[PDB]
């Protein structure tokens, strides 16, 4: 998380938590982005911790939604 914050940094954090490939889609008009990943082996507590990490890291004006694919 330290240093430059871009798309790939957030993807790296999300994969470091979810141990899987992550794809992000951005909504400029609605000020929203969604992270999609495969959660066939991901727990709820680790997902909550990842979301809290992202919220600490994410720019304040943006919305963040998670998309666990089962």
């Amino acid at each position: 998380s330290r240093g430059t914050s871009t798309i790939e940094v957030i993807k790296s954090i999300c994969e470091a938590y979810t141990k899987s490939e992550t794809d992000i889609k951005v909504y400029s008009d609605e000020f929203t982005f969604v992270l999609s990943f495969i959660a066939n082996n991901c727990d709820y507590k680790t997902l909550l911790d990842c979301s809290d990490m992202i919220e600490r890291v994410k720019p304040a004006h943006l919305l963040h939604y998670l998309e666990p694919i089962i």
Binding site: G3, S5, T6, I7, I24, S28, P59, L62
Partner: protein, 346 residues
Amino acid sequence: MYSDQTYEVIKNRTLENINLDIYKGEGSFLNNMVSGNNLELSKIYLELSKMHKMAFIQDTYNQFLDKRVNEFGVYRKLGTESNGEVEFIGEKGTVINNGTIISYRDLLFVVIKDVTIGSEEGDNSPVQALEVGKKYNLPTNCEFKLVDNISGVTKITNTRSFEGGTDIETDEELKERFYKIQRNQATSGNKAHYEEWALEVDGVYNVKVYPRWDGPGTVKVLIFGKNNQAVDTETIERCQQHIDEEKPIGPTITVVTPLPIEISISAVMKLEDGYTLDNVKESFLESINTYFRDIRGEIIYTKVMGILINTTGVHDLSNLLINGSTDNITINEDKIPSVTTVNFSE
């Protein structure tokens, strides 16, 4: 210290520390027992020295370097194969399917699309290198050979040089890239940073950034070439990717280039002897092109008739009109006037 600690020294220290009444020298029972494990300790000291150089990132060899960089998130490049197009010569009607393997020297290449010799689509098929490496960048005029024999094919050769072959990133390159990335600090918010990244790219000498141009979360960037000229398409693309890899999440990005303006001129002038309309027209177009290159801001009418009168062959002129008027023409941003129509009447 670690280098000083050797079999002889540790053995002497061990023998001095042990307290018996027996004789301690070469060939003694106690000396025989003490030796044998001190040698292994001297061996162990060297690995103990080496472990620190193993651990760090300045000198990590290959796999430990990969692990330590993966900790931060950077990945070693896997390279790219070389891609090119060859020509097939032989019996007409012969069909070669995709997946066929061709070879030049010890290298191996694969055919991507089907080609029929003599077919109306042509006798050229793109070819991709099987492995990665710069050695796969074959030049022009390479005479290939089929790995698996196919009847009706006689000659395989390429008309354009193969390109795209790249090597795996060396340790020094990866370490330098990692240090470069980590040293830099970026706050992706302020507007001046967009101009900064746009200016970092090559071929740019001025940048303008437009906040809130196409609704919320939109940034438009106006890059310029040398002396406020229009940039090439490739420069626009490369700047686009640069700021894209340097931008945060959320704002959509568009980059454009200057768009020319149509300027039509007209005047009634008196010519000198030995000069025709074409000669004065060409000299005036040259001079006005230089002017339009050098002028910032709005156009100047009096400079226009000055550059017109100085044009050789003009004895007098009157009724000089620019775009239907004698007024100064304002030039907006990313706009460069061009001469469209010149109506000169003697």
